[PDB]
From Swiss-Prot:
This is Membrane protein insertase YidC 2. Keywords: Cell membrane, Chaperone, Lipoprotein, Membrane, Palmitate, Protein transport, Signal, Transmembrane, Transmembrane helix, Transport. It comes from Halalkalibacterium halodurans (strain ATCC BAA-125 / DSM 18197 / FERM 7344 / JCM 9153 / C-125) (Bacillus halodurans). GO terms for biological process: protein insertion into membrane; protein transport. The chain crosses the membrane at residues 36-56, 109-129, 139-159, 183-203. The keyword Transport applies. Required for the insertion and/or proper folding and/or complex formation of integral membrane proteins into the membrane. Involved in integration of membrane proteins that insert both dependently and independently of the Sec translocase complex, as well as at least some lipoproteins. Belongs to the OXA1/ALB3/YidC family. Type 2 subfamily. The lineage of its organism: Bacteria, Bacillati, Bacillota, Bacilli, Bacillales. GO terms for cellular component: plasma membrane.
Length: 212
C-alpha cells in the first residue's frame, strides 16, 4: 500500500492546524449570526492577543540591538579592514561579538523566531478560508471573503506602510520596510482571497494601536 507519510503528515496539518482555525472562525461567526467578516476581525485580534507576550519580547530585544548597532558594526568595520585569510582572525572577531552580547545578556539568532510563527498561522488561516465552503462566496462590505479583490490588498499595503512609519517615529532597512514590504503585500494580496488581506489590515491596525 502507498506510504502513509503523505496522508498522515497532511492529516496532522488538517486536524491540528487547519481545523482549529476553521472551527474558531465559524464558532464566532455563528455567535454573530453568520457574520464571517466580523469573525475574521475578532479572530485576528484574538490571535494578536496570544502573540502579544512573544511580540513584546521581540520588540524589547530589537531595542537592545539598537544600542549595540554602533558597537558591533564597528567591530565588523574593523575586521573588514583586517586580513580574513586566517581562520584565527575570524575567531577573535567571534570572541569580541560574543563578549558584547554577554555584557548585556543579549542573544543573536533569537527574536527571529516570531518571524517564523506568523507563517503557519497565516497558512492555517489561508486553508481555513479555502476549505470552509460557507466563507467562499460570503460577501463582506464590497468583497467576497473567499474571492480575490482589487481594492483591499492596497489597503493592506497602505496600513503596512503606516504601521512601519509610526514604529520608526516611536537607512537601508528602513527603505526595505517602508517600500519593499508594502509592495510584496499588495502583490500577494491580489493573488490571495480577500480574507487574507482583511486579516492583514486588522493585524496592522492592531499593531498601530499597540504602539500608541
Amino acid at each position: 500500500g502507498q506510504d502513509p507519510i503523505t496522508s498522515e503528515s497532511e492529516g496532522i496539518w488538517n486536524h491540528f492546524f487547519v481545523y482549529p482555525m476553521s472551527w474558531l472562525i465559524t464558532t464566532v461567526a455563528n455567535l454573530l449570526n453568520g457574520s464571517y467578516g466580523l469573525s475574521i476581525i475578532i479572530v485576528t485580534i484574538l490571535i494578536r492577543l496570544a502573540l502579544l507576550p512573544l511580540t513584546l519580547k521581540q520588540q524589547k530585544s530589537m531595542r537592545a540591538m539598537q544600542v549595540i548597532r554602533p558597537e558591533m558594526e564597528a567591530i565588523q568595520k574593523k575586521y573588514k579592514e583586517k586580513a580574513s585569510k586566517d581562520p584565527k582572525v575570524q575567531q577573535e572577531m567571534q570572541k569580541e561579538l560574543l563578549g558584547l552580547y554577554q555584557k548585556h545578556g543579549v542573544n543573536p539568532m533569537a527574536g527571529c523566531l516570531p518571524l517564523f510563527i506568523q507563517l503557519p498561522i497565516l497558512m492555517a488561516f489561508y486553508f481555513a478560508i479555502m476549505r470552509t465552503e460557507e466563507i467562499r462566496y460570503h460577501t463582506f462590505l464590497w468583497f467576497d471573503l473567499g474571492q480575490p479583490d482589487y481594492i483591499l490588498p492596497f489597503v493592506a499595503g497602505i496600513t503596512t506602510y503606516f504601521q512601519f512609519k509610526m514604529t520608526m517615529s516611536h537607512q537601508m532597512q528602513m527603505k526595505v520596510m517602508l517600500y519593499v514590504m508594502p509592495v510584496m503585500i499588495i502583490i500577494a494580496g491580489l493573488s490571495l482571497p480577500s480574507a487574507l488581506s482583511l486579516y492583514w489590515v486588522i493585524g496592522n491596525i492592531f499593531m498601530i494601536i499597540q504602539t500608541y
